[PDB]
């Protein structure tokens, strides 16, 4: 944007998006770790089976 005020409006959008993304990403990574951990139990059993 062309002015400090329009840049502030864009930055409010960015600050919103980046926080939201990081909150989702934290839970995304945590969920990946649960999925991996569940499978890391199961591989032993599943390999045998």
């Amino acid at each position: 944007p062309e002015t400090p005020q329009e840049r502030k409006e864009m930055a409010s959008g960015v600050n919103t998006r980046i926080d939201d993304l990081q909150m989702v990403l934290n839970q995304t990574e945590d969920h990946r770790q649960r999925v991996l951990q569940a499978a890391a139990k199961n591989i032993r059993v599943w390999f045998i089976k």
């Binding site: 998006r17 939201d20 989702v24 839970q27 995304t28």
Partner: protein, 221 residues
């Protein structure tokens, strides 16, 4: 016993009356769990008799819906890859796969989808998992000034039921997945915050679908 059930299933009058006994659930469990070709054949024959002989298209749809819900279509697809000494098994599989395919086409109607949303019946009706529906129809949710999205977000605001919540989140996810312009619409409805709350819901089924939905909302500008 199932040969006796198959005899009952032959007559249209009995096909309408016997619905009360929950036959398709029980016989679908047996069809999934039991290996024997005899049992398999006579169940597929009973199912064919139900969808052929029922007095109503609605009774056929009730049976076919119960079969689809009871994972019968997935089992039929596996049974199509399995092979037999009696081709009547394969013809009954093809007949059922076609009649359940028609039931999926009926269920894939945007009017049925709309009716289920308006009725709040967000209960994993197979419409929700119809990739064909979402891929080819997701733009339709914009109708009547975005009325179906207003319902989905209102259900994510109002509902206690984890099924209704998980399903409404799933629907928001598929809406974005097949109509990316819809991200801005969900943001205009505030619905991003509802799925961002429900990713912390007490039920993992809600958490999972809410996580998928917020992830699709957040996937790109």
């Amino acid at each position: 016993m199932i040969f006796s059930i198959w005899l009952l299933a032959f007559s249209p009058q009995m096909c309408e009356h016997l619905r009360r006994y929950n036959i398709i659930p029980v016989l679908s469990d047996i069809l999934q769990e039991s290996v024997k070709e005899k049992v398999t054949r006579i169940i597929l024959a009973a199912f064919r008799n139900f969808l052929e002989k029922s007095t109503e298209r609605e009774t056929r749809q009730e049976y076919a819906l119960a079969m689809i819900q009871c994972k019968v279509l997935k089992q039929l697809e596996n049974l199509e890859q399995q092979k037999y000494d009696d081709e009547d098994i394969s013809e009954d599989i093809k007949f059922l796969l076609e009649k359940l395919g028609e039931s999926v086409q009926d269920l894939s109607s945007f009017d049925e989808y709309s009716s289920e949303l308006k009725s709040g019946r967000l209960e994993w009706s197979p419409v929700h998992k119809s990739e064909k529906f979402w891929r080819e129809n997701a733009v339709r949710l914009n109708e009547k000034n975005y009325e179906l999205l207003k319902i989905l977000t209102k259900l994510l605001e109002v509902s206690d039921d984890p099924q209704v919540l998980a399903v409404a989140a799933h629907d928001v996810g598929e809406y974005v997945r097949h109509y990316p312009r819809g991200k801005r619409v969900i943001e205009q409805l505030g619905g991003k915050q509802l799925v961002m709350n429900h990713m912390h819901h007490e039920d993992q089924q809600v958490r999972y679908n809410a996580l998928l939905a917020v992830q699709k909302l957040m996937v790109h500008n």
